[PDB]
Amino acid sequence: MNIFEMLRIDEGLRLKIYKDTEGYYTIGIGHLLTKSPSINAAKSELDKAINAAGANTNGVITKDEAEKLFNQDVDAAVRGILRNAKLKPVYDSLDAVRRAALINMVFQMGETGVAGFTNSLRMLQQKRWDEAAVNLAKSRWYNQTPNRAKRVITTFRTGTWDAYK
Residue 56 phi, psi (nearest 5): -125, -170
Instruction: Based on the residue annotation, tell me whether 20 is a catalytic residue of this protein.
Output: yes
Give the residue among 3, 8, 17 at the shortest CA–CA distance from 75: 3
Whole-angstrom distance, CA of residue 50 vs CA of residue 61 = 8
Q: How far is CA 141 from CA 68, 78, 108, 116, in A?
A: 27, 20, 10, 11
Instruction: Pick out the residues of the known binding site for substrate.
Output: 32, 107, 120, 135
3-state DSSP of 1-47: CCHHHHHHHHHCCEEEEEECCCCCEEEECCEEEECCCCHHHHHHHHH
Instruction: Based on the residue annotation, tell me whether 64 is a catalytic residue of this protein.
Output: no
Residue 106 phi, psi (nearest 5): -60, -35
Range 112-120, long-range pairs (CB < 8 A, 24+ positions): 112/84, 114/87, 115/84, 115/86, 115/87, 117/141, 118/86
Residue 100 near residue 2, CB atoms below 8 Å: yes
Best CATH choice for the domain 1-165 from the list 3.40.50.10800, 1.20.120.1200, 1.10.530.40, 3.40.50.720: 1.10.530.40
Q: Which of 5, 10, 11, 73 is catalytic?
A: 11
Give the residue among 41, 16, 39, 37 at the shortest CA–CA distance from 27: 16
Q: Which of 20, 22, 75, 162 is catalytic?
A: 20
Whole-angstrom distance, CA of residue 28 vs CA of residue 8 = 10
157 Cβ neighbours under 8 A, 6+ residues apart: 129, 130, 132, 133
What method was applied to determine this entry? Answer: X-ray
> Strand pairing partners for 26?
18, 32
Chain-centroid distance, C-alpha 138 = 19
Count of CB atoms situated within 10 Å of the CB of 70: 22
